[PDB]
Amino acid sequence: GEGFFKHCVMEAETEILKMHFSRLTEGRQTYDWTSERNMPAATALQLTVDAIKETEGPFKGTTMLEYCNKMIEMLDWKEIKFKKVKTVVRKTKVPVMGIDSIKHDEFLIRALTINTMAKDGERGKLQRRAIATPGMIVRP
Amino acid sequence: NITGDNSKWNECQQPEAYLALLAYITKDSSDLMKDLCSVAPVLFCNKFVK
């Protein structure tokens, strides 16, 4: 064809512009940067969107495009608030939920951060080739 | 015929070349979704590895 890329990109634009961002929860494990741990994509996305809600207010986007717009808008945010459980010694340590703050400098690095997974279920190698699980802002 | 298998297939490929290629594919498509195509590679062009 002469229109190969134009047409394939047309199909992609169609399917993505339709897409609710909730289907972003479908997939492998991804890196939740709130607690800085690896999580199933659904819970990690719940923490990301919930943090956006507690910082700037609830997210009404309901589309992949508006989710991406909010992602790129957060990079200019000078302050971000998290749901982070902090242990308080009451001497018994009760891990009381808390609200944490972060600065654009740290948040950018946390957004570009990828995490390592020591390989499991791989067949046929003596030495392990580890697999990476990128963050939630990079995924869409 | 030959059976080929590639080693370090991921370490050799680079998101910069993917940024150029994605810019080539989105040339005529739309300027609205092209800026949305170029954003994916640049997050792997500057990326942090734990």
Next chain:
Amino acid sequence: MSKTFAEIAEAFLEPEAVRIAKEAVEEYGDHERKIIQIGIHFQVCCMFCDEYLSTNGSDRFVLIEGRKRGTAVSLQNELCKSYDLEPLPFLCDIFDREEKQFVEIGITRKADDSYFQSKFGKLGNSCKIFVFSYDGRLDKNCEGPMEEQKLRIFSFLATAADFLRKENMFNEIFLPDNEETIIEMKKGKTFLELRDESVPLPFQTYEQMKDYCEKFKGNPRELASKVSQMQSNIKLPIKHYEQNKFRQIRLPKGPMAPYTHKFLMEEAWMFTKISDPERSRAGEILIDFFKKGNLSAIRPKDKPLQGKYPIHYKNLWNQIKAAIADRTMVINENDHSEFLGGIGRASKKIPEISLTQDVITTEGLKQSENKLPEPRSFPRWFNAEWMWAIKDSDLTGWVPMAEYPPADNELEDYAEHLNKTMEGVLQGTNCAREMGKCILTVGALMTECRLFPGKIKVVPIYARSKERKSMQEGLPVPSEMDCLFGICVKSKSHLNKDDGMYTIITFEFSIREPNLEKHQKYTVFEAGHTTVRMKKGESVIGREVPLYLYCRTTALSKIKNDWLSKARRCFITTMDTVETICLRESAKAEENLVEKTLNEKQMWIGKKNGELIAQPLREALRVQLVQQFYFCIYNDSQLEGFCNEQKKILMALEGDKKNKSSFGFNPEGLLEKIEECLINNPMCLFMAQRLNELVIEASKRGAKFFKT
């Protein structure tokens, strides 16, 4: 799912009504999705107009929206001719000949006021302006359309709204002058900077890379680029006959490889007990009923042969015997703490915060080091182990196998018969014995990890078997029983967030003198004397034979507990490999050769007296079953590297079989990867050496290979 916009539009809309959206969308403005928006509006007009003809051949309304722009201009000047009304600058949708006035129709998602103030701001009272919401909200100019068209257009807008909700397209369909202007992708200064320094080329600003991309036209200069790249890449022409040696296969040198199986096979000894259904149903009480026999009397001497930790194991044995009397849990809290972890010690951890001073003042001799496994050499005993697992044991079968399903003549006769024969052959083998004991005992441990976490329990090592008699008197009964290989001990089963591995202490009976070379991990004792007798046509008294007690400690991962708990899988992987051979042959002759192929077809099995030996496919089936069972038992990362890099050797070999002149590019590197994955694994090194012999005999048959 819908892959294209024309699909979405033509799905819920009228087929020809979409074509006007596509055509108008091609030229006057350039947006791909927005067809759907006007796909609503356009159709919203049509049902409006056709409905009324005013008492004349001429229609009541005329439609200027769907037409072409330049034509719509002049056709709007026609109205200045007919009714002499002011020539409005904004081109409206529809003109009424009954009301003789301008008509335009908006459609908005939000509350009607938001848009109606916009369009009313545009055209004022000069036109009849009707603004509908999909939800049933209504905004209008002075007078509304007739009662029928209201109802129809509102029903349509409602249904279309429900379709859009089902496909979840909402904010994108918003009115042009409100939301269409912001169709752009949000550009943050952080992202624009990141993108501007992310570009590969000597160009910095993203715009220059964008220009070189969009404007790119490649010339045919990649032929010289590819030939200069070829000159830079000097190497990798490849010829089989040049490297056909493959330097045979490299093999490690050192001490002989030990016995890595969690249990002993060839030298293991059995204790027979005829089983009660209600007594043996527990399977934990099996040893409690065993102890009422002669098992309780056996005790080892303090001085072992070839023991590493004699007194510990002896004390633990006495704790097992004492426990079995009361209950099968061992109560020693101090004893297990040292044995656990594979004599692994719990190492105290000092925080880094207080450690800095200990770096300034170095004490405790602070360093960091890791350790590697020591390589071993090709095992001898392994061959004897295979030859023992190959022959049929006196007991009939060790593996629980369910009943056969009902049969129809065509297939299930063939399938049921093949399964009856293969099962009948493989149940009698000693390999089936080790399979059965593995399933039963590792299942027992698997239950014990849920039953008593963090507790010490005595688990038997047993296998169930019913005895066969083919002499074929009708007889009293065939003997149904279960036999005991030895006793086993489990430590703490606690499960870490990372992987935990349980520790296990195995005690097995044996009639056989230990061999220091392969048993180095085992601690052997002189246990006692065991009575063994037979009855034959000869006198066959049998005397008594000394009994040795083998002890060791091993690690079991929960994953290993599972995959070793189901050993039955091996049968299937044998079955397929066997069954195919019988079909591929018979399918050639279009006849039933299965029974004939099993007995007649000869498979090369082993070598004796320097002569290649072959056995029929039914008895050589045991070789495949043993091979798969060893694959299950002996599986290490080393083994998987070995096989996954070995398939290349096999494919090159069959490449030289049919004389296809096969080649592989850096055989030194391939043999370095095969060498790299051979360390301590007995099965790995064994299949390596056997591969050497395969290369030798194949090179003798015809030479695409080398012999030293």
Next chain:
Amino acid sequence: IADRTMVINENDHSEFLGGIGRASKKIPEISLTQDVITTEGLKQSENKLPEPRSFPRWFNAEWM
């Protein structure tokens, strides 16, 4: 019946005919001796007899 009273199905009648009678493939005796030496296909010989019934009731109503 709409077009013409012949049914065109060549596969359908083959199973129904013979009274659901199946066409049984015949193996010659000359090649059969080996199959006696090696018994396959479960070779046997048997014949069948009709199952007896009991006095009908409905017959009287049929006569009447």
Next chain:
Amino acid sequence: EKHQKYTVFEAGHTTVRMKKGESVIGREVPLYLYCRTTALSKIKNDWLSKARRCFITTMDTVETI
């Protein structure tokens, strides 16, 4: 019991009516479709094809009396 060889269906409904001195409407009655398969020998085709013979064997037996 007697139809064991027959395969019966539920075919439909058939209309049946009469005219008498009474009202006799008749409404409708369900229609069943009986199916079966049988064997016909050519000899049976012939001897069953001529059933008129029965009359004669009755006639004689009657007429003699």
Next chain:
Amino acid sequence: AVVSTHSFRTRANRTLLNTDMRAMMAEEKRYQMVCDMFKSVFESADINPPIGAMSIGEAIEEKLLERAKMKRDIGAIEDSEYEEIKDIIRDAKKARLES
């Protein structure tokens, strides 16, 4: 899949509940009783994804009013009990508005 009588749900371990992960899950449970509530009100919620432009609470309230009118008009339930349900609905609308 055949449902028969034999299909059941498996209990999760006590692992994630002991660590702080539960202290984070306190939000997910708050989603839980919500989704379970809406599924009790709307039976096809899981099968057909809910649509229309309305709030979850608004649809729940008006639907509860419709079922209350249904059971009161023809079926058997008391009128004063209907008005009690209406009272609970409006009293719920108060606390819903305050947020």
Next chain:
Amino acid sequence: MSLLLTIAKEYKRLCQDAKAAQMMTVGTVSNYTTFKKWTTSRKEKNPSLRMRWAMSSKFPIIANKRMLEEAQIPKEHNNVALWEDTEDVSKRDHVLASASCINYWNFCGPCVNNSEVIKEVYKSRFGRLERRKEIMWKELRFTLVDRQRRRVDTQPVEQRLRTGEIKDLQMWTLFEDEAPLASKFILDNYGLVKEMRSKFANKPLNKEVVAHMLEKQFNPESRFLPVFGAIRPERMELIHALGGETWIQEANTAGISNVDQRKNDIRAVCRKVCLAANASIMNAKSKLVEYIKSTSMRIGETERKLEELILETDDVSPEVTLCKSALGGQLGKTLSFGPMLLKKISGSGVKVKDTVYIQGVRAVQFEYWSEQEEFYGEYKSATALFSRKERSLEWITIGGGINEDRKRLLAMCMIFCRDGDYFKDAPATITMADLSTKLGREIPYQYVMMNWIQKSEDNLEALLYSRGIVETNPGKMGSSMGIDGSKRAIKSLRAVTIQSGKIDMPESKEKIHLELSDNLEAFDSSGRIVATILDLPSDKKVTFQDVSFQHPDLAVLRDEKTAITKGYEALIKRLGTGDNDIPSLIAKKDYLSLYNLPEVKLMAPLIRPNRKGVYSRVARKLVSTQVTTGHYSLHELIKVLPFTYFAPKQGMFEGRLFFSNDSFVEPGVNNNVFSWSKADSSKIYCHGIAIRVPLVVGDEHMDTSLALLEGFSVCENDPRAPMVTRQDLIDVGFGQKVRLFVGQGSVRTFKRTASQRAASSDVNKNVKKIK
């Protein structure tokens, strides 16, 4: 009673929590679909092994409480503890219990008479068993070449439909309370709605289950599968027991569902319709769409329109492509040329025009293609692979089974190839094949010589010999193709080799649609000539249980019968809109206005004059005695009504048979003129069918009196109209704006309406006007 109360109180508690209150308020209801996705994401790593660890414990299982206490004793027989009052692990209203109790209630439980309810829910599965009952068996062995990739319906079921519409059926049959009012599917396809909703709606058991199983009941799974050459979708269900690489089985094709032949009947229907559009070339675009939307198909158990069958049918025939092209259905990845089917796997190029000579010393333009292009040919019992370059075949290989079919493949693909020898043979082509006689239309040339080859037997031998013939070299012995289609390889054609085996079929998931040219040509994808004009010239008319309408150009319509049937259609169709129509009169109980109706005066002259009054007396009697509600049959009123107009005389003679121009219409007693259908709304007048949806309260329609009652539409939300449940909607009369809860929570308002009209034609006529 407290089941609603405790839900209301639960809502009170939930909205009292502000964190849950705001997330309940903000946004659409669609957020539920996201909210549910935020839970129970954790799954165990081990599929079986974790389950073994689960069943190891004696009381692992979560089970309900109330039902067990209601039916059966919680305590055991053997004194092994069963029940406790403690809820442990996850906290939910279910209390934990042992596994064996399930077995106990399966043993001694008190349940009766569930048998009939089960099967027709799972009739997909139960039927897939029923089919295995009747088959016979034979076993052998061979080295079998299966056809590797066919995308073919597996698990086929009658009345198969698309996923969206079957979701609509799901919503309507599961529950009425929350459902959208969905026009397109419910209006046209009603009567399957009546059946499914009728059987599943009355006994509220396993709502979710029955739903998700009915989703799979109507959904044939078309996967990419190896087949050994029996392509009927019934054999696809169980292939494994039947065939494989070494497998063989016999006595199958006989037993099949009624769908397999019905599809072919639809192919013949599209044949006749496309012929009707072929008769008049004034316009082919506007007529064929009429012939489509007018025709009504009768599926064995259900009446369904031809539009929704054509658009949504799975199998794409050369005809079916033409019938879809008139509509907006997108079905691509299909090439149709004559009887042959083709798929394009490679290359591209532009259509060019080249004028080349015939033997009659005359020049005619030929449109050819210059591309290097690799396509897959498909013909009856034969498959092959061809590649053409610059208007001549480059590479060819034949995988066909039968020799004749191989020759046909070779021929047809040579026709599509269009070599130079294509021009050299012209034995009397011009006299007939040159000019097709349809309003003086010149028929395209590829199809011209295609038809010349379809003509006689020697015409095949002509072009078969037109290819180069050479004695093939050793090593091509098995691949060589004789003139008659054999492998003897003494003499063989050039640039062709047979393969021993079949040839795999490509597949692509793609949708492409474009408008059709006036000659029944589809230029879709800006070229590609996929419509192949007329595939086969069968001149035959045979139909069984099929409906046509609107000047079909086939004459089934007598004068007297069109007088009777059209006279009925005036009454049936024109009534139901508003006051002074049948529904308002029936609601008023006044049947006198119903007698005097002006549409009855149209029917009056057609009755037999002799008994006219004698008929009218019994007719008026029947209509009057049904005025009492609940006793009236709404079809019998239409059947009986037209005879009431004349002054009743006391006949005393029976009026059962009503002669209308010497044809009788009896009460009940469905006949040629009047067919009275049971348990669904329709009726048949000879070869055609009509029905009126909006108002039918006829007593047998109880299951959908909520669905059928709708002739309404949406107007405005302004009045405060009492919120009426769907069962309360039957009471509100005409012109009454009322407020109603719709679907998933969006609430709108309606009145009694003239139904939506001219969904298509309203746009089509204006689009034609603007040109």
